[PDB]
Tab-separated table of C-alpha atoms in Angstrom:
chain	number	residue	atom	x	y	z
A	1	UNK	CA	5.052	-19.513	-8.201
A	2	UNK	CA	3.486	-19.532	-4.754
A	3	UNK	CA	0.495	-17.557	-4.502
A	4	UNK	CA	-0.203	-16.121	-1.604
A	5	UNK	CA	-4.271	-14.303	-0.319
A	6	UNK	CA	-4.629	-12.419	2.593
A	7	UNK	CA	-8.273	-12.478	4.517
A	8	UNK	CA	-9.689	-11.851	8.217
A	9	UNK	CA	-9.308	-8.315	8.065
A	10	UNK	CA	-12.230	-6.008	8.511
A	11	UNK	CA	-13.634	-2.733	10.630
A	12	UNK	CA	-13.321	-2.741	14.380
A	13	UNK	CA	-13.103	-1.335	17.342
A	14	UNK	CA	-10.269	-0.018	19.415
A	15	UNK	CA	-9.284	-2.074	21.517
A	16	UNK	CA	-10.594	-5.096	19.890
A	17	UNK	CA	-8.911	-7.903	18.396
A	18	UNK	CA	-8.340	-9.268	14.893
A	19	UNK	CA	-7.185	-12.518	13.504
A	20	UNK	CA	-5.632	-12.073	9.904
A	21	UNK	CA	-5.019	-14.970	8.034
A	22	UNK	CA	-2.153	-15.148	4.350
A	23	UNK	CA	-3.306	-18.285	2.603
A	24	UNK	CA	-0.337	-19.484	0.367
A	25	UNK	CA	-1.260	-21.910	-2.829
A	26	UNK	CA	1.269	-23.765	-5.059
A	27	UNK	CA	4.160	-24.034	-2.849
A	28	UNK	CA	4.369	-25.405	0.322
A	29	UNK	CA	4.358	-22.713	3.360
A	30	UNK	CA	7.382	-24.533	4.598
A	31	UNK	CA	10.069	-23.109	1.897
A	32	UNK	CA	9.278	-19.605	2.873
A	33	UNK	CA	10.200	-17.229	5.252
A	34	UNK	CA	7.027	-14.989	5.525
A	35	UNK	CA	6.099	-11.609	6.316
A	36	UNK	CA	3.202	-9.125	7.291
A	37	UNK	CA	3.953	-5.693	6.174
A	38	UNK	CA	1.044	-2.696	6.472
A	39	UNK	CA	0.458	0.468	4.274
A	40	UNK	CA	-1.168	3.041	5.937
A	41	UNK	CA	-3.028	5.813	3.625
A	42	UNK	CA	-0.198	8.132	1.943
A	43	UNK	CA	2.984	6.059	3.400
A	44	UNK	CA	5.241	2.978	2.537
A	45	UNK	CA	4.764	-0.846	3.199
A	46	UNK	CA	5.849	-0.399	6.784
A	47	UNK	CA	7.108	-4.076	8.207
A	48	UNK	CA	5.019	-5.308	11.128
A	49	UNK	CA	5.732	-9.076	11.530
A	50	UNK	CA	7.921	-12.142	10.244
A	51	UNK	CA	8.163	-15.964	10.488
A	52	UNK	CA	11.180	-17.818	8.912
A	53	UNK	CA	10.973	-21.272	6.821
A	54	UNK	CA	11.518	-23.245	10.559
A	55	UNK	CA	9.027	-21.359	12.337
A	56	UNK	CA	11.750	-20.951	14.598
A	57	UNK	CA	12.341	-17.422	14.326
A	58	UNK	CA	9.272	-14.869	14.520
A	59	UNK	CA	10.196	-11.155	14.367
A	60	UNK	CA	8.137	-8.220	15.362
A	61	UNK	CA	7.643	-4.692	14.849
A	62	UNK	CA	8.529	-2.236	17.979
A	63	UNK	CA	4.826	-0.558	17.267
A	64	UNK	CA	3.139	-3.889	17.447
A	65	UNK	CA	5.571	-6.026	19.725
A	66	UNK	CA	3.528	-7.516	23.043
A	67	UNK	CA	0.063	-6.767	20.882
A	68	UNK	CA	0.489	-9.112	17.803
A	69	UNK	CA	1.424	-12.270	17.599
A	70	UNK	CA	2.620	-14.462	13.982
A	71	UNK	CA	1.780	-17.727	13.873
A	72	UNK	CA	2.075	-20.973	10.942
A	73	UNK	CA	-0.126	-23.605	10.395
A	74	UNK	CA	1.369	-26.917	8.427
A	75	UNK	CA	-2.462	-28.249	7.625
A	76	UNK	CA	-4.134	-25.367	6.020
A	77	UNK	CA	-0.895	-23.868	4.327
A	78	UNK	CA	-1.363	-20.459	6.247
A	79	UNK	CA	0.346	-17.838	8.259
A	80	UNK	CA	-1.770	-15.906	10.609
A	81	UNK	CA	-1.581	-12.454	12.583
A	82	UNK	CA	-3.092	-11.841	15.587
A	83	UNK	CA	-3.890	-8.365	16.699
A	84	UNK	CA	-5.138	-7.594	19.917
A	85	UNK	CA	-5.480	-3.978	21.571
A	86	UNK	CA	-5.781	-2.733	18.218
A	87	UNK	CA	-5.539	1.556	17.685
A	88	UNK	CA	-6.796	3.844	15.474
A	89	UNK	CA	-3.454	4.267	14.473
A	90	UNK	CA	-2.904	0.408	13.004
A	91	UNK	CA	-5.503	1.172	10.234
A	92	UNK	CA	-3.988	0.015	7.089
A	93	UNK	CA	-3.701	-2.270	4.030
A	94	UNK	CA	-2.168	-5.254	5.608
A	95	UNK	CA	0.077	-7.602	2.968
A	96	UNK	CA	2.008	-10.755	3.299
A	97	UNK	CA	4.981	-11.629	1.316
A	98	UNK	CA	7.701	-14.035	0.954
A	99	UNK	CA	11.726	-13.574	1.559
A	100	UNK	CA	12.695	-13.814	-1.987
A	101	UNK	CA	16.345	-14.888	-0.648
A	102	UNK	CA	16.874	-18.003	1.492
A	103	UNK	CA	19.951	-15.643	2.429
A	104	UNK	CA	18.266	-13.674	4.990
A	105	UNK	CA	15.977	-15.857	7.635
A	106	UNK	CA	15.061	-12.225	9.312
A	107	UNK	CA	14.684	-9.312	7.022
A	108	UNK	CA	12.913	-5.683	7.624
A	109	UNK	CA	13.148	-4.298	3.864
A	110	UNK	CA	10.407	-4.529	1.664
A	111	UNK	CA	12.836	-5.160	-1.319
A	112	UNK	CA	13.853	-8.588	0.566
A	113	UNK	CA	10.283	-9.566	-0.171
A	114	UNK	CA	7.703	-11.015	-3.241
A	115	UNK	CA	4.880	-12.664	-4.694
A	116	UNK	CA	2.690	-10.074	-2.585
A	117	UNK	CA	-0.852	-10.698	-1.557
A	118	UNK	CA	-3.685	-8.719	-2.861
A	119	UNK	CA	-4.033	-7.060	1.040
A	120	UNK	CA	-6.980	-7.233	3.376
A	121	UNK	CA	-8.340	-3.739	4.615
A	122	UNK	CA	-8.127	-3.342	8.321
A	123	UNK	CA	-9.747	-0.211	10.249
A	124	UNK	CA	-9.560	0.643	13.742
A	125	UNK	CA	-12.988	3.687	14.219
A	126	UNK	CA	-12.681	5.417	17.972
């Protein structure tokens, strides 16, 4: 039972950047493949970014591609998210997750995912 806390989120401007950081506790960060998704106000968990178990593979959203950037560090058991040239229209909850298959190394669906974070509130003012 990994455990997983999401922080570094915040109110900013556009055009600024952000770094967000999931924190994972219990397990080691290693056995995971992991995975930022975002919920915007009246929509689904929309996926934005993954990193497999290797940090080999590192997937991206088409919205967010060339902006963000996912990122593991061993040390401090942590996945982060950076987010430059942030909108308006990236204001959301932003989660991280776990692949709860070692089947899928890449996966889009928020049903391939679990032991969800608690979120970290990022908004973007004009």
């Amino acid at each position: 039972e990994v455990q997983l806390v999401e922080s570094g989120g915040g109110l900013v401007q556009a055009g600024d950047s952000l770094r967000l950081s999931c924190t994972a506790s219990g397990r080691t960060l290693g056995d995971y493949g992991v995975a930022w998704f975002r919920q915007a106000p009246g929509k689904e968990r929309e996926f934005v970014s993954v990193i497999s178990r290797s940090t080999i593979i590192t997937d991206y959203a088409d919205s967010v591609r060339g902006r963000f950037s996912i990122s593991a560090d061993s040390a401090k058991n942590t996945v982060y998210l950076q987010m430059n040239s942030l909108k308006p229209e990236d204001t959301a909850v932003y989660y991280c997750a776990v692949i709860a298959n070692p089947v899928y190394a890449t996966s889009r669906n928020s049903d391939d995912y679990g032991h969800w974070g608690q979120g970290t509130q990022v908004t973007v003012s004009s």
